[PDB]
Symmetry: C2
Subunit: 351 residues, 2 copies
């Protein structure tokens, strides 16, 4: 019920929401492994596959983490999160050229700031919307900062309860910018059984002004396609130009072929989803005309004999004077003439 | 909400319902073009692709239609419905051998009776459940007959309003047999835009004891996969051993490859669908440990100085004494010692 709404906002010229074509965000993320060259190759692959939006991650490691980060290992790598972010991070000059390049290909560039300095770098660049990752969903100070920039926010909600998300959404509303909530599970990769697509409806019922989507880290497109069937408006998967690239997120990334598959499925499900059972489909009319049943004589019935459940039955097609709906209303009427076995009962056959 | 239920029943040894693996019904239908040989080839192809259930149509043309049927043409052929059914119908001997053959391959055989004589033929054969097609959804006399057989009913609901379906469901309940409702659109093939998957939820809210599914006549699997994401339990598509066969339903039929695709997608979506947003996923724990932020000093703070929003900030990872959740609670506390810029605030750092 709640995901079928008219909520919408714009990311540059692209309208997003239930009544619009679903938007697939290609998250290049840290997939370029810190090489501007590789990022360009991945942008090209995304452009050529028909992508509309390319999303980056903005890492300024010194403002993003304290020295404790050098001693903690993520679940999908074997060195510290600090080492990974330091190796992968693009400096400001390079991130500016990356945005310029994505925009040169007619695509929208957005990014996820992981820190205050990251957020301020992106505001200087003037990006059209901000993604907040699940890690920062409960980082209320960072959300305050980002919301003050006056751009729409796409908030990922993994690792956070409805009540925790509420505090983030209050800050966003107070700032007066529109937002989307992406349901998300941050296990790299995500087992099918942990996706819980019903979480999207949980989010929509709690936050009726939110545009709703899915960010996904499973091995394929099924989860995202399911999210589109349920009403999702934004789909996010990591993206790579090819699956033999190194990096911790490559495994759950889409490539050009699987992007195109998702785009086509998303289009199909956008059209198929929603609507109402009772809507009359013009195209069904011919089928109804032959497939519905009319009342027929099940026996020779003499003039003056009573019609009954023993001498009446129903058969296709639907053009007889009495529809199967009216079968029992004929019980006890009297034959106005001889009625031939197998003939449709006519209005002139009854007194 | 309503499709997530514990409703179930058995078709022979196969349990069907939201809490069970979705069931794909391979409708051979009239695809054999009246040849027992061809039907066997299609059964073999279904068995080898991993099908669980093969569904037939039982046509006894004389009890199914009056002479008017020889003058009406369906929307996906160019001769009368009578001519098509007469050419395609298997006689009783052949239908008995077809059931025997499907059961010899360890599969379940069910059928759709299109008439009273068809229904009685199938009762003599002792099929384990009955499908009622959309045409007969409102054929209340036929539904009464079929329900009296004491087997579960799978009812297709195309071309019929919730109110019309109600009358059919009342008859089924009175008979005391369990049932499923399949949402359906009878246009061959169905445009994506006419599918209206939300009709499944309309059916579940109106009929809370019903097992719910989709019968589909689109050109591919997207609709069915969407139905599984929403909670659907039974999927029905026409089936052929190959796509170069003649016949009016071949166009929208699945073949062995597309059956297997649907089976795998259905399995994936069965696992992914439903659930709750607030459920704590054990597998997310490592990510939370590195991705959440702790309060840090944003400046050198001398012993005795007050903590504030100017000399405090937040940074990854999440192992500090104060979580980002507690950031503002530190405002106005007094430094118990020199606090180093960038260090996590500890409990021993405050008076
Ligand atoms: Mn991600
Ligand atoms: Mn059909």
């Amino acid at each position: 019920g709640a995901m079928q709404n008219n909520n919408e906002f714009k990311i540059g010229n692209r309208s997003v929401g239930y009544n619009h074509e679903p938007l697939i965000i290609c998250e290049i993320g840290i997939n370029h492994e810190g090489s501007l060259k590789t990022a360009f190759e991945m942008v090209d692959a995304a452009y050529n596959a028909g992508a509309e939006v390319v999303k980056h991650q903005t890492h300024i490691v010194e403002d993003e983490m304290s020295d404790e980060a050098k001693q903690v290992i993520p679940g999908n790598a074997d060195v510290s999160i600090y080492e990974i972010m330091e190796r992968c991070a693009l400096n400001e000059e390079d991130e500016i050229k990356l945005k310029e390049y994505v925009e040169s290909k007619g695509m929208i560039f957005i990014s996820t700031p992981f820190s205050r300095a990251a957020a301020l770098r992106l505001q200087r660049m003037d990006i059209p919307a901000y993604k907040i990752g699940s890690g920062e969903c409960n980082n209320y100070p960072l959300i305050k900062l980002v919301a003050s920039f006056g751009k729409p926010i796409i908030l990922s909600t993994g690792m956070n309860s409805i009540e925790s998300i509420k505090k983030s959404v209050e800050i966003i509303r107070e700032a007066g910018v529109p937002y989307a909530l992406l349901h998300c599970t941050n296990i790299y990769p995500t087992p099918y059984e942990d996706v819980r697509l019903g979480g999207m409806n949980d989010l929509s019922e709690a936050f009726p002004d939110a545009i709703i989507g899915l960010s996904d880290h499973t091995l394929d497109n099924y989860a995202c396609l399911g999210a589109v069937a349920l009403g999702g408006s934004i789909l996010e998967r990591h993206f790579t130009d090819r699956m033999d690239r190194p990096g911790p997120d490559i495994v759950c990334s889409m490539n050009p072929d699987t992007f195109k598959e998702l785009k086509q499925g998303a289009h199909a499900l956008k059209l198929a989803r929603g609507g109402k059972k009772d809507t009359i489909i013009a195209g069904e009319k011919p089928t109804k005309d032959f497939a519905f049943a009319s009342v027929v004589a099940d026996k020779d019935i003499k003039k003056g004999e009573l019609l009954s459940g023993d001498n009446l039955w129903v058969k296709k097609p639907g053009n007889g004077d009495f529809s199967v709906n009216e079968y029992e209303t004929l019980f006890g009427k009297v034959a106005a003439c001889n009625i031939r076995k197998g003939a449709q009962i006519k209005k002139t056959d009854i007194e």
